[PDB]
């Protein structure tokens, strides 16, 4: 919701993981120091025409380090539903100069990963 980027839908059964040096969405207005953050999982409850609640595919939202719902979580703090990503050469500093997004101000950036990025099974745009 407050994320600057769109979500990464989880279609299969495995969770979102990235090897070291990958996972950070591309941001032209950010510096190589900024390319470091985390993802956060969210599930949805829908009510089909059957009148019965149904669970939809979980989605993951990127948040720069020190920002978002887990702004007070150090990098690497193990917690279910939160995974961490970083580009080699990025500082471990909360990027409050980037902040979160206000849905009344601008739209979410289309989450794009560079060519050569490895995505786990069940993850595709």
């Amino acid at each position, epitope marked *: 919701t*407050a994320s600057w980027f769109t979500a990464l839908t989880q279609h299969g059964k495995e969770d979102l993981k990235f090897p070291r040096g990958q996972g950070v969405p591309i941001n032209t*207005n950010s510096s190589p120091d900024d390319q470091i953050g985390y993802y956060r999982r969210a599930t949805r409850r829908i009510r089909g025409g059957d009148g019965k609640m149904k669970d939809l595919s979980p989605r993951w939202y990127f948040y720069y380090l020190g920002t978002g719902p887990e*702004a007070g979580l150090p990098y690497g703090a193990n917690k279910d539903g939160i995974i961490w990503v970083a580009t080699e050469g990025a500082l471990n500093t909360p990027k*409050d100069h980037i*902040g*979160t997004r*206000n*849905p*009344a*101000n*601008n*739209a979410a950036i289309v989450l794009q990963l560079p060519q050569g990025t490895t995505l786990p099974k069940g993850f595709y745009a």
Partner: antibody
Amino acid sequence: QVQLQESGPGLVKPSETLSLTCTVSGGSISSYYWSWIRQPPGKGLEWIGYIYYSGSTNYNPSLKSRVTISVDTSKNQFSLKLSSVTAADTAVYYCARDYYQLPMDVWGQGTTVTVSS
Amino acid sequence: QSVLTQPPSASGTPGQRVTISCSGSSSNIGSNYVYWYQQLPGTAPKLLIYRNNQRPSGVPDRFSGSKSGTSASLAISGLRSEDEADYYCAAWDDSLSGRVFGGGTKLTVLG
């Protein structure tokens, strides 16, 4: 249902500090953005700043040197603090709320504050 | 630019169409949403348009907004004497990291 109401001083000596607060009835602070807007008599609107989740802030850089906005989730209120007030700070001060994609969708009545000795 | 520039005044014949302009830079209009507000005398501003062209509930459908490039426009069809008010455009600014208003446009309905 949501209604806003500003309250505080109606007059503040120059070089002092303006301190207004806005009380939210009909809803909660929650995760919404709560702004402060001022308008001098006969002039245009000027955005001061807003506060939101985790008390995070954004200020107009023109007033950033002197402005401080706070929030109190318990009292369902948020306040404005403007220091070293000059005559250019005499205006009607509004509080507003950003409801997701609708910015400043609900405004308060606006309280008139004048800076004079 | 880093501010929004509107014409200071405008007027039109009732029952017809009139538009108000709003000029900005790539740091505000050229990159973020534009929203419009109406301020009747003695009252607080009222949201007319959000997300460039979306209408909140209660706003008459004769109000219409648009944006292209670094400019935005507010169109009012079927002008009515009750539309006589001040109109403000506003948008987020990445350079200032803050919200910026336009000067405002005095609308005068005739007849």
